[PDB]
Design a protein around this ligand. Structure first.
Ligand SMILES: CCNc1ccc(C)nn1
Length: 164
């Protein structure tokens, strides 16, 4: 059936205070069907809080919207994020001693543009320790990676988390 609603949402920060439900929707409907679109407002003044959210029908639509950044909405470049600890680096554990840089590259390059691959080695012996760090040029790669239940790299079932 339908992917969980939480995984179909984009929070949108940095809105122009003149953006409305209607103008935010007209913008983001370019990349898919929107089931919901709200600008957050003060309950008493109705003045914009400067952020909102949109909900797409599918995760592929969320991907399309993030691939179309930067978004200029009503004259202002906004900041869309998936459902925040916003980082560009992941820890990859469980890769043992036989996983190479090209294994990590070939797998993770389909999530985002890779800038650094660091396979960790023992400070004394030089032996591989069984984990690595991958740095991307942008946070959405990481956000897509860490919501997956599973990552299989070089036949290993890997543990992947955000790295600070
Ligand atoms: C040690 C390998 N480092 C990297 C960095 C970036 C890319 C794309 N591939 N490999």
């Amino acid at each position: 059936p339908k992917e969980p609603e939480q995984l179909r949402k984009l929070f949108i920060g940095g809105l122009s205070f003149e953006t409305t439900d209607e103008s935010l929707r007209s913008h983001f409907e370019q990349w898919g069907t929107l089931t919901d679109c709200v600008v957050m407002r003060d309950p008493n003044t109705k003045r914009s809080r400067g952020f909102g959210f949109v909900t797409y029908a599918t995760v592929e639509e969320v991907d399309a919207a993030m691939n179309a950044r930067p978004h200029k909405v009503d004259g202002r470049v906004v900041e869309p994020k998936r459902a925040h600890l916003t980082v560009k680096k992941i820890f990859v554990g469980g890769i043992k001693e036989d996983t190479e840089e090209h294994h990590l590259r070939d797998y993770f390059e389909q999530y985002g543009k890779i800038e650094v691959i660091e396979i960790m080695t023992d400070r004394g012996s030089g032996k591989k320790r069984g984990f690595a760090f991958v740095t991307f040029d942008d946070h959405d790669s990481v956000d897509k990676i860490v919501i997956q239940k599973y990552h299989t790299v070089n036949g290993h079932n890997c543990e992947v988390r955000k790295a600070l």
